[PDB]
Amino acid sequence: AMRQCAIYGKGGIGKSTTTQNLVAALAEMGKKVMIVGCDPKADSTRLILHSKAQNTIMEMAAEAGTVEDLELEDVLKAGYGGVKCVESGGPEPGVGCAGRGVITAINFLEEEGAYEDDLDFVFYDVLGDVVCGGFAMPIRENKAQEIYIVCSGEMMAMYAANNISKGIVKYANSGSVRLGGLICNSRNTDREDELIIALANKLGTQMIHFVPRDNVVQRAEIRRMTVIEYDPKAKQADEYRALARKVVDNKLLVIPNPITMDELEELLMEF
Amino acid sequence: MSREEVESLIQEVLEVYPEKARKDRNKHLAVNDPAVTQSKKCIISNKKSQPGLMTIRGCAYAGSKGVVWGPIKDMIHISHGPVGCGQYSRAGRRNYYIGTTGVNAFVTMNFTSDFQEKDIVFGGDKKLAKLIDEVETLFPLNKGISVQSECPIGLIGDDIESVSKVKGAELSKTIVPVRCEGFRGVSQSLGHHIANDAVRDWVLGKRDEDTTFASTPYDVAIIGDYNIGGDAWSSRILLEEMGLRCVAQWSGDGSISEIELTPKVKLNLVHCYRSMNYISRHMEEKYGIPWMEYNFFGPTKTIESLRAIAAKFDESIQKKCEEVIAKYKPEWEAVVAKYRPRLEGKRVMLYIGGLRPRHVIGAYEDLGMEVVGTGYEFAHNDDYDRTMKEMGDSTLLYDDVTGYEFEEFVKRIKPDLIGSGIKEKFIFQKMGIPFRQMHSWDYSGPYHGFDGFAIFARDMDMTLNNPCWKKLQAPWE
Amino acid sequence: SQQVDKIKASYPLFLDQDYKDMLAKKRDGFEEKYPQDKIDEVFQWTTTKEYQELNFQREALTVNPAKACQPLGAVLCALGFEKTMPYVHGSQGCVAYFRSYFNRHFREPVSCVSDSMTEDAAVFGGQQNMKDGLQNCKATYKPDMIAVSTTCMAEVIGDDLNAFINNSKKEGFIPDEFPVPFAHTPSFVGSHVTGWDNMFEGIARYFTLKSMDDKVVGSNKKINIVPGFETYLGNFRVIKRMLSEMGVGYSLLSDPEEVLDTPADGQFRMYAGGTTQEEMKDAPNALNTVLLQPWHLEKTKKFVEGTWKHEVPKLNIPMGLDWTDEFLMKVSEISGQPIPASLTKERGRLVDMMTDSHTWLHGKRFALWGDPDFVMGLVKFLLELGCEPVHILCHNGNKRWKKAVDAILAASPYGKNATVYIGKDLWHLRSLVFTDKPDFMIGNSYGKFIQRDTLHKGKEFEVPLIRIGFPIFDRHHLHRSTTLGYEGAMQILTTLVNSILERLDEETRGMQATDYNHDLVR
Amino acid sequence: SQQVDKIKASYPLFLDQDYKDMLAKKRDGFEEKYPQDKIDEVFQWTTTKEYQELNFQREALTVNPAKACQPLGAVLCALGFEKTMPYVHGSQGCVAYFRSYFNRHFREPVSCVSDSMTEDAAVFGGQQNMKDGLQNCKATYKPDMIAVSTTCMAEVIGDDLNAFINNSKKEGFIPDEFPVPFAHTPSFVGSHVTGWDNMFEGIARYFTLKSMDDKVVGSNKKINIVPGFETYLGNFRVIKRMLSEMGVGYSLLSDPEEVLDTPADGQFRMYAGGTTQEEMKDAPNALNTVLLQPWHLEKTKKFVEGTWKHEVPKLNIPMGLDWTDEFLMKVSEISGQPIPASLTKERGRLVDMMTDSHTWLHGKRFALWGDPDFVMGLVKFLLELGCEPVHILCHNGNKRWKKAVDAILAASPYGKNATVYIGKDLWHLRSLVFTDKPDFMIGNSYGKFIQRDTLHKGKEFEVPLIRIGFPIFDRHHLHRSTTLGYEGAMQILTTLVNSILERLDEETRGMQATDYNHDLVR
Numbered sequence A: 001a002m003r004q005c006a007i008y009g010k011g012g013i014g015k016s017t018t019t020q021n022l023v024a025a026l027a028e029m030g031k032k033v034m035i036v037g038c039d040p041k042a043d044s045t046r047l048i049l050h051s052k053a054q055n056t057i058m059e060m061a062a063e064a065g066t067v068e069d070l071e072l073e074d075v076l077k078a079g080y081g082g083v084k085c086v087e088s089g090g091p092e093p094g095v096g097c098a099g100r101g102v103i104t105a106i107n108f109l110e111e112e113g114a115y116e117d118d119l120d121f122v123f124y125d126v127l128g129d130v131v132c133g134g135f136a137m138p139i140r141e142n143k144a145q146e147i148y149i150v151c152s153g154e155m156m157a158m159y160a161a162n163n164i165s166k167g168i169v170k171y172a173n174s175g176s177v178r179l180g181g182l183i184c185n186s187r188n189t190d191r192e193d194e195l196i197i198a199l200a201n202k203l204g205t206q207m208i209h210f211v212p213r214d215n216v217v218q219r220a221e222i223r224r225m226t227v228i229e230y231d232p233k234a235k236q237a238d239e240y241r242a243l244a245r246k247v248v249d250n251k252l253l254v255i256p257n258p259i260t261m262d263e264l265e266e267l268l269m270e271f
Numbered sequence B: 001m002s003r004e005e006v007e008s009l010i011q012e013v014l015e016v017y018p019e020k021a022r023k024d025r026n027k028h029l030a031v032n033d034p035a036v037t038q039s040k041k042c043i044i045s046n047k048k049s050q051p052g053l054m055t056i057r058g059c060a061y062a063g064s065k066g067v068v069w070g071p072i073k074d075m076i077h078i079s080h081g082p083v084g085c086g087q088y089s090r091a092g093r094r095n096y097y098i099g100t101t102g103v104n105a106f107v108t109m110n111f112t113s114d115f116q117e118k119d120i121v122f123g124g125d126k127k128l129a130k131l132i133d134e135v136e137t138l139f140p141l142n143k144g145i146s147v148q149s150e151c152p153i154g155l156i157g158d159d160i161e162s163v164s165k166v167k168g169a170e171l172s173k174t175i176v177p178v179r180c181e182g183f184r185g186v187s188q189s190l191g192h193h194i195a196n197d198a199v200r201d202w203v204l205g206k207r208d209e210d211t212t213f214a215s216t217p218y219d220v221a222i223i224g225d226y227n228i229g230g231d232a233w234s235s236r237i238l239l240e241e242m243g244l245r246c247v248a249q250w251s252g253d254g255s256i257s258e259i260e261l262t263p264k265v266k267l268n269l270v271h272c273y274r275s276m277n278y279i280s281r282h283m284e285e286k287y288g289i290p291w292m293e294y295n296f297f298g299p300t301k302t303i304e305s306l307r308a309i310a311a312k313f314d315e316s317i318q319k320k321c322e323e324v325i326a327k328y329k330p331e332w333e334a335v336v337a338k339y340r341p342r343l344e345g346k347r348v349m350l351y352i353g354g355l356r357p358r359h360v361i362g363a364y365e366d367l368g369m370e371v372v373g374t375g376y377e378f379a380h381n382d383d384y385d386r387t388m389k390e391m392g393d394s395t396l397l398y399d400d401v402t403g404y405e406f407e408e409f410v411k412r413i414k415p416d417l418i419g420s421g422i423k424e425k426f427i428f429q430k431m432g433i434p435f436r437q438m439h440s441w442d443y444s445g446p447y448h449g450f451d452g453f454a455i456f457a458r459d460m461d462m463t464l465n466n467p468c469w470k471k472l473q474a475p476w477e
Numbered sequence C, D: 001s002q003q004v005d006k007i008k009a010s011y012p013l014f015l016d017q018d019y020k021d022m023l024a025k026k027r028d029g030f031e032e033k034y035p036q037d038k039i040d041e042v043f044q045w046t047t048t049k050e051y052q053e054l055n056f057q058r059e060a061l062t063v064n065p066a067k068a069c070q071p072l073g074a075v076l077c078a079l080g081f082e083k084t085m086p087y088v089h090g091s092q093g094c095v096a097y098f099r100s101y102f103n104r105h106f107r108e109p110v111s112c113v114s115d116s117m118t119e120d121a122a123v124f125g126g127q128q129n130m131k132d133g134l135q136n137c138k139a140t141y142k143p144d145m146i147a148v149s150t151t152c153m154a155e156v157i158g159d160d161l162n163a164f165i166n167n168s169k170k171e172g173f174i175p176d177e178f179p180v181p182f183a184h185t186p187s188f189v190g191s192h193v194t195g196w197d198n199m200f201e202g203i204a205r206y207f208t209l210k211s212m213d214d215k216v217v218g219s220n221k222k223i224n225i226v227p228g229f230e231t232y233l234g235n236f237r238v239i240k241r242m243l244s245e246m247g248v249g250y251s252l253l254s255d256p257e258e259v260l261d262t263p264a265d266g267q268f269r270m271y272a273g274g275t276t277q278e279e280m281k282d283a284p285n286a287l288n289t290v291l292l293q294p295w296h297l298e299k300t301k302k303f304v305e306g307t308w309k310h311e312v313p314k315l316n317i318p319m320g321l322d323w324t325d326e327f328l329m330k331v332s333e334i335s336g337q338p339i340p341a342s343l344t345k346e347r348g349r350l351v352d353m354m355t356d357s358h359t360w361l362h363g364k365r366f367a368l369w370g371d372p373d374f375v376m377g378l379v380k381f382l383l384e385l386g387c388e389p390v391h392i393l394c395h396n397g398n399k400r401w402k403k404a405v406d407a408i409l410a411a412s413p414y415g416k417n418a419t420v421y422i423g424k425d426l427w428h429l430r431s432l433v434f435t436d437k438p439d440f441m442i443g444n445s446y447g448k449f450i451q452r453d454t455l456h457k458g459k460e461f462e463v464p465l466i467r468i469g470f471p472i473f474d475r476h477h478l479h480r481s482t483t484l485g486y487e488g489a490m491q492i493l494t495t496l497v498n499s500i501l502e503r504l505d506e507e508t509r510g511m512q513a514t515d516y517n518h519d520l521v522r
């Protein structure tokens, strides 16, 4: 009963940080977890590993010539709490095709039995600009069955939530992937929690947790750590454990009903 | 035969389709009226194919690499992308040439960048630069390079123009980047256009400020003859016997220097309008060179073409014209005397690309045969405009015909002979209908010109009257 | 000009003096051709070891490859199932080439459709093409099954076949129970044989993955046979013939033998024969599954072992004497049936032929190429015959396969002068047959240009091509031959020794010069 | 001299300069050879119409015959019966030749004995040789049957086989019931095919003549098949396969296919398979008897019609499409079994191949030779393919057969340039292929010297040999082929069209000269 989960949301909203801090907390509880970075800048596991160099699937493939010559233990590493980390990798900006890089990397993991071993969780950390089919590789059948969308009370971040939910629908109708909830990564806006709870209901999901804005998150990141590792007794660390507990016990999995850009404008005026 | 009946057949055949496809295909099938001058009133063409209906069409890469650029014999053409496209197209088209292959000519070879997954993900411009260095090392007598894009090149945004410019300057070589990724357009046709534009932009102007070529008033170029089984050679011999000088042929047996010299000619002779009218119009706009369509299929059209062409010049050429026509008259008359009695009254259906479906009709008629249905994979309405006056009243026209349609039409019209492509051939032979390949000439030809007519006539007779066609039914059935 | 009673086609028409004269004028006047002495000098250079070193330093350029792309193989796999339409999601240019390629080799109709994704489908995805395509194809050609693979444009943009197909069903474009198995077949991975493996595993998964619970290994008392990418009709036929001869119950999974060889009797048959859907659904109940071409059936093998729980035997392709022996003994072991007197006699007749022809075969040197299992079977049988493979090329081979073939070579004193090349092409092979000349090439029709090149150096340097493999376009009906089993070994042996004798007769046909050795009896 | 790592056999060893110089000195010193100019002039004269006239005026000289003598055919017929030893009464030199001749064609052992009549046996007759010969042969080689034919010396002196064999039994040299069928087989009458006819009729007579009273036509529900002189193993096999496919009970009378194809498994089998004595005894109870090669089975026909009272069908050899059709339909009528779907499909596959290959076959011109039935079957099939047989030669044909082949030619527009020659030899045929050049020859290995002669005039005059017939000595295992039925027609078609394409490739292999037409796809 391994649970596969994919994290999406507006560019810059805090997907990678939230994911890694969440996963640290899961591992702290005794859960066995793998993080799959699905972003060519390969920064999804930076805070879990932070010791020793990480090599990406695509980089290692290029060096070896093809993916077939690649071995799973060359690209799969364990960091804090025994969390297993792997990065798709991809080109530098403005060249090549990062989308295909993610397809190739997840196909490799599937073929090499990464999803054997008894993991409780797999998380795909995806980039904000889901510009093609490749970046939806994590929510195909036999991949993520639960999507968590990171948002905030800012307009751009709710429009992103809705628009991502739109993209989710063709996969949800055709398979078993489902929206698991919204994660509010706070931008200290007025009545943010009530407002995200409101957007959740229009979509038909829930706000699974409200994550406060706390600059300890950034201080941990500068040290290449999660808050869980950096300062295990910080208030914010407790927030992530709280988030992790909800995720563990969550059963709410729905198909999103995206709303009009008009309804969204209605929401934001009425608050 | 009978207009109401043909229209009945069309609607019957259309009954099998879902509504969306039915509505669309209806617009691509017509009963001919030779009176009609605007084919737009009668048939729609050059539109996207309906998904899943087994179109016979190819892609823009076929139209660019396979058709226009591929025949140029002293250049090396790179199929840029994965290994598939260049391999299926390797030496499948009989664009004949004279050269030392692998040394100064390269037509039958398959050069490719053989894209692997890392090339997709990380892009192929560095691989292409290195590939160009290796081409120069191993094929030093090549006289230019083309880069023919396959599908992935177009998606991932590789900058092949920049690579062509930088390596071109570094090696003092003409390198021609062609964006003929196969998902562009709807058929081979946009590939023609893209390829014409690449010639225009990267090759044709090279000698614009050079005056060292000594031109004469009888200089012409053959535009859009790809020398299938030697077709262009058996055309070129007639033009030169008529006293004209053929400075270039585009692009069958063609060389890059012929292309560069083409702006110096007095008249462009266009055989394939579809594939080369673009550069023909360009040359009239930039160089002032007029162009004219001609037809060298069969004696009636060849004779008519020779006189029309000769009237463009002076009395000396017109005298030589009539002397050429006199020379060949007993030859094609003997062909007609021998073969027309064997073929008289036989009925033919054609389906080909963008020219031959109308262009070969005259030749069939010179043998007393009747074309009762014709159509094109990728013609535009200016092609159908030229077709309707060439076809008989109440004949069937079909644009981008489906495998299903073509078979159903054939079952009802029951032609004596079908002329189409390799993907059609074996279907109809099994139905017991004599079939001639009218792209590859069934590894025969040439069919252009007087010498070509004799072979055309021989081939139609050999197949239509072959003893195999009487043997398809077991005696005990 | 033409004489009406002896009409000339292009050859020899253009050898006429007036055409020769006209061509000379065209060349000298307008082609700005390199002088002939320069051409001769460069040609001679391309035959040297110096050129060969430059040639083998290539890292980016491929010239005259000896492989094709994945969906070609997917299409051939799909054609082996009853009333199944191959369907390639993506660009239609691909399908025109796939069909043509196969038309030319089999000289038969090849039916396959596209959903004609254009530029706007590249940008917006091909979901609507799949919906309309499946409905259209089903209405028009009435297949019982549609087998979906992909072209490279649909693979770059990550069109999710699974999702697209299920949404077509959910939205009522095709019935929910209508079978639409699928496989992703990226042309920039592996080759045509990889596509066959992917398609097959996709079809196998589609019919068995959800219903394993009531399956019991061995309960239908048959052996499954998976042929892989196969373009000789005789090879499907000989396997069925030998198993029936043994009284072994079997199920050939992907069997295009009928649809690739329909009679010409007045009707076109779009479909014929093939593996049934019930055969696929019942396949896990077999005693075991045998893979005829294991070096490109690795995905299939993983699925069959891991999901059907069959103990797939470690068997080489059944080519030549030893490996056909091993195939029959393993089938005998699995099914409990003895090897019958008739097959034992067939074996002994192949051995007889080997003893009869060994003197002309001994020490003969070959270059050869093709797909990995085919090439290794040919290498193995050449060693059995006392021949010397010298240049072994497999453009789509891998490192593990190359080590396996080196080991086979090392096990025979006849393999001592042999080198195995992977990732190299027919322009590489060209250099090899100049710098280290063999007696013959064994390969497909692309080899004819190498023979042409070698003759131009000189008659004494010519290396004749023996056509065995795929594609063969320039002879007729060779696709009807056999390369597997004792029957295929007999056909190959006969082709080799008579290629040798044909060349010796040519070399000894010179009146009062070489014909002292133009023996009546050989 | 020899280099040990590259040893040269006669070719190319004698091309070394020191051997060339030695041969020049031998020629000039001692051979008093005609000047090369005179040799060239006479050679050229032998290719002319004036030479052809002189050639066809021959009434007494025969040069390079295309036939052999009766007892050869008697031996082959005898080999088709179970545990039967062919025995040729007369001179032993004959048997050494018969055995060697077949050894070389089949590449198999050929068992036959002589009773070694010497000069005193010529004068006193060979009765003692028969007595001792029969006893020795039976004791030593333990046949179940000895089938006796004759060499020409025993035919001149009138050795009475019947009396000599019966006295051998009366005097106790062999048991009275031991079967010893015989036939007189004079080499100076007819040819090897006549010897087959005579031997078969002798064996048929031996087992049935005295026991006709209890026989009832049709009571065993089988059809007898008499193959005649047949040297393709595939032809015995295809006839049996087709009858079994139809469910027709049959009896193949004279069946050497096992004994001419024993396995190499460590034991020599002097006998294998063959028609049983019980089958011959029971043969008059068949529904009917079909003769596969009626133009050399006339004596057999007379016996079977007159004594067995079978209404032997008037059928041509089952070669090509029409005559295989006619054969199947007659068998269907006689047996009451329908022609099954499988054979109907096979027919259509042949027709498909004819449609696929018709453009390269059309109008192609052939010279051919061989035995009467084979030649007429080949002519018939050539006409069906749209080919033009031009020179048809049957050295052992007769005036009735020639008129029948002329009728077949007249019935097709493709026969208009054909001439049929009987009583003429391969030196006659050589003139014909110079004066009226065909594109190919179809014939046996003796055709290679004609191809060599034509090449000597010039490459453009060369007429390549296509090997079909008997004997074939200079290629291996072609005796495994098939020429009868749809299967044989497919093999012949394939051979013809690929001979045509092979020659075209050769003619278009010239770099920058003829290779504009060196097409990948044909």
Ligand SMILES: Nc1ncnc2c1ncn2[C@@H]1O[C@H](COP(=O)(O)OP(=O)(O)CP(=O)(O)O)[C@@H](O)[C@H]1O
Pocket: A009, A010, A011, A012, A013, A014, A015, A016, A017, A018, A039, A126, A127, A128, A129, A185, A186, A211, A212, A213, A214, A215, A216, A217, A218, A221
């Ligand atoms: N709860 C919180 N309080 C304060 N800062 C936070 C925070 N959560 C995330 N951040 C900061 O926000 C910045 C962006 O975080 P992150 O990299 O996780 O966003 P993202 O993953 O959505 C970027 P992309 O869209 O390119 O994939 C980081 O510097 C991080 O430390």
Ligand code: ICS
Pocket: B063, B067, B093, B188, B224, B226, B228, B272, B273, B274, B275, B352, B353, B354, B355, B356, B357, B438, B439, B440
């Ligand atoms: S170029 Fe065109 S499909 Fe004009 S793409 Fe096609 S060698 Fe056809 S009817 Mo193949 S517009 Fe040429 C043609 Fe015609 S390849 Fe040839 S036969 S005259």
Ligand code: CLF
Pocket: B059, B060, B061, B062, B081, B082, B083, B084, B085, B086, B149, B150, B151, B180, B181, B182, B183, C069, C070, C071, C091, C092, C093, C094, C095, C097, C150, C151, C152, C153, C187
């Ligand atoms: S429309 Fe090429 S055949 Fe294709 S799956 Fe890609 S490698 Fe194979 Fe045209 S440019 Fe070519 S032929 Fe198609 S891919 Fe596109």
Ligand code: CLF
Pocket: D069, D070, D071, D091, D092, D093, D094, D095, D097, D150, D151, D152, D153, D187
């Ligand atoms: S010992 Fe001649 S093979 Fe004979 S049956 Fe006569 S034709 Fe025939 Fe010697 S000389 Fe010759 S080979 Fe014999 S016959 Fe005598």
Ligand code: SF4
Pocket: A096, A097, A098, A099, A100, A131, A132, A133, A134, B155, B156, B157, C156, C157, C158
């Ligand atoms: S959008 Fe996605 S698929 Fe298209 S090229 Fe960019 S990365 Fe590749």
Ligand SMILES: [Fe+3]
Pocket: B426, C106, C107, C108, D352, D353, D356
């Ligand atoms: Fe066919």
Ligand SMILES: [Fe+3]
Pocket: C352, C353, C356, D106, D107, D108
């Ligand atoms: Fe033998």
Ligand SMILES: [Mg+2]
Pocket: A015, A016, A017, A039, A043, A125, A126, A127
């Ligand atoms: Mg991120």
